Design a protein around this ligand. Structure first.
Ligand SMILES: NCc1c[nH]c2nc(N)[nH]c(=O)c12
Ligand SMILES: NCc1c[nH]c2nc(N)[nH]c(=O)c12
Ligand SMILES: [Zn+2]
Ligand SMILES: [Zn+2]
Lengths: 372, 372
């Protein structure tokens, strides 16, 4: 396979379905990427993550730089070898978790300085250091280091943060290109900023396209603005990005948000919702989410979802998983998480299939009717 | 298969190797039974428990009667169906956990009354109720309800507790037999008591044999007396039990204790050590246990054990599992537990094979040399 190749097989409105070929594997789009925070998709062996249908997972740079360390992981052979996942891995730049997980956060044009939450140690992170850490991890899709904008944001602060992000996007690009092995085996995605302002989103898209990237993320959304506003911003923001490259919406994972985002041109998604809420007792179904801890499931012999094809729904009942979760049992988290991630992959499959068959708008309509 | 059939294929000294045929499956002895406390072998799917080589698991009656309840489990189809384990399940009587997990413990000749630790509710447990609960669970090997003796114990208190246990053994036998479905599909094991006193152990063995059981457990050991004392008691206690029936040592699980116990005539074992210490960071190896949390394993690329055939040792390094455990990750517990239980099953296999080949004493000698 090539270093990176994105091809669109079918379209319907703004929605697209296709594939991204990379050295470690093929990624079917629209894609949902399970999150493996500290070198692990919580409560799941990587073979199970693959069994659910995932083509690629996401790795948190911020968490890995702290524990077990980027240099350590490189010495051990890289992230793939370390955790046992041999397919593509997209890594974020780490700055987003710094702005809300660490202390000291002394920000500047060079980068960010911070204190670790689990040690109180001192760390510096810049566009160059971020790209280097992702390289040490052996990341397949490297994210440019940016500065997120807090919601709500004034036109002035959003403009300043966006402009800085564009300068940092140029630095990330040059850093990535200067490392031969990385530029030849990995891919680099740029991140569009500009809060909820159209002119700013346009300036950001233009700067990013000028620099040139393998993919384009829509950053700064899903930060408290609500679905209506997020969708409104996507309406004018996605069309600004190069059409022939993947469009990645960062930190968006509610089933309904995914469907709406795909209708607006998004090809990639990631979120901890399926895993996090899985361990918390929330199970996704085609009839909407349910909290398995609720007493009405104590003697319910039906599977989490009546149509789900996952191993959990084939073998265990709601009553058993209800017991496991209320008893704080590890198997409860394992089962809930596997089902949720599988449900998400099945959602992506139904999306890819319906677009390929030119009946995606109807699928979205039917999905919503039943889900809500 | 028959309801119960124990056949000895080979012997060496007091050690025996053979099989127990039951309606749900065959049990190779000497056997080690993983513990599934609250309807789950902690951090493992039942298919994984089976993949490690386990022929049978143990279920805690005390925990299940509290949550989710015996009657509830019966309504749901039984324990096998409930947790997804279709092979034999041995269930304890529940009294042992009552004497050290609950409150109020008002003891009498009829049974025990207590307060649940997770609710503070009132529960009564007697030989009849215990047998009934195990029936509701759909248990394959039912344990007679007894009264354990605290270590150390005076000859007088040990005699009184043993005599009461023998009366309760008769009540358990009659209760088991009165339930047609249970007497025809399940097996009943009696429990020998008598602390560390020979004359008492003999009286207990005689009473048990008089009543007649499918198997005989050696109770009251591994309660703080030490290996030397435990072995000394087993030396004279096991020969007192009927030779043609299985000998089960309750709550004994250190690899070295197992080897010594088999040399003394024990055929069955159970303990939480492999699972409990697994989640705590202790991994068993042929070179003795190691605590994976120790810093010397942070960059150790070797598997938990150099010879282990388990899936964990085939796919992940000590460095990765070290990271997982220190990060409090669920996958850390899953991997450590699977390896430990697999290591235990491999130990039982090497024991069964060496006895079959008449070289068990040499295996025990070699095992100890390297393990210590
Ligand atoms: N929900 C938004 C989001 C999640 N992660 C992110 N990482 C970066 N660099 N930028 C972003 O905007 C975001
Ligand atoms: N270690 C001893 C032990 C564990 N579980 C037990 N259960 C019963 N009924 N009796 C016992 O002696 C024991
Ligand atoms: Zn499912
Ligand atoms: Zn192993």
């Amino acid at each position: 396979r090539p270093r990176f190749s994105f091809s669109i097989a079918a379209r319907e409105g703004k929605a697209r379905t296709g594939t991204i070929e990379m050295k470690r594997g093929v990624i079917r789009t629209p894609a949902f990427m399970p999150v493996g925070t500290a070198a692990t998709v919580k409560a799941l062996k990587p073979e199970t993550v693959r069994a659910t249908g995932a083509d690629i997972i996401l790795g948190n740079t911020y968490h890995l730089m702290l524990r077990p360390g980027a240099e350590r992981i490189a010495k051990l052979g890289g992230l793939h070898s370390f955790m046992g996942w041999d397919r593509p891995i997209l890594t974020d730049a780490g700055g987003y978790q710094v702005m809300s997980l660490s202390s000291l956060t002394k920000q500047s044009e060079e980068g960010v300085t911070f204190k670790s939450h689990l040690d109180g140690s001192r760390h510096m992170l810049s566009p160059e250091r971020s790209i280097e850490i992702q390289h040490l991890l052996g990341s397949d899709i490297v994210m440019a280091f940016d500065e997120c904008t807090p919601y709500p944001a004034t036109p002035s602060r959003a403009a300043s943060s966006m402009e800085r992000s564009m300068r940092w996007a140029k630095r990330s690009r040059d850093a990535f290109d200067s490392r031969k092995e990385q530029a030849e085996n990995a891919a680099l995605f740029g991140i569009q900023q500009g809060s909820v302002f159209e002119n700013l989103r346009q300036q950001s898209a233009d700067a990013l396209a000028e620099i040139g990237f393998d993919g384009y993320a829509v950053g700064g959304l899903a930060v408290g603005e609500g679905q209506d506003e997020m969708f409104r911003v996507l309406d004018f923001s996605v069309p600004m990005l190069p059409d022939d490259k993947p469009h990645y919406l960062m930190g968006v994972g509610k089933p309904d948000d995914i469907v709406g985002a795909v209708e607006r041109g998004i090809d990639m998604f990631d979120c901890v919702l399926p895993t996090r809420s899985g361990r918390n007792g929330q199970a996704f179904t085609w009839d909407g989410p349910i909290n398995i801890r609720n007493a009405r499931f104590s003697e319910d012999l039906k599977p989490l979802d009546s149509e789900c094809h996952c191993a959990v729904c084939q073998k265990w009942s709601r009553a058993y998983i209800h017991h496991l979760i209320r008893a704080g049992e590890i198997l409860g988290a394992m089962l809930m998480t596997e089902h949720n991630i599988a449900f998400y992959q099945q959602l992506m499959q139904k999306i890819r299939d319906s677009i390929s068959e030119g009946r995606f708008s109807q699928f979205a309509q039917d999905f919503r009717a039943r889900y809500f």
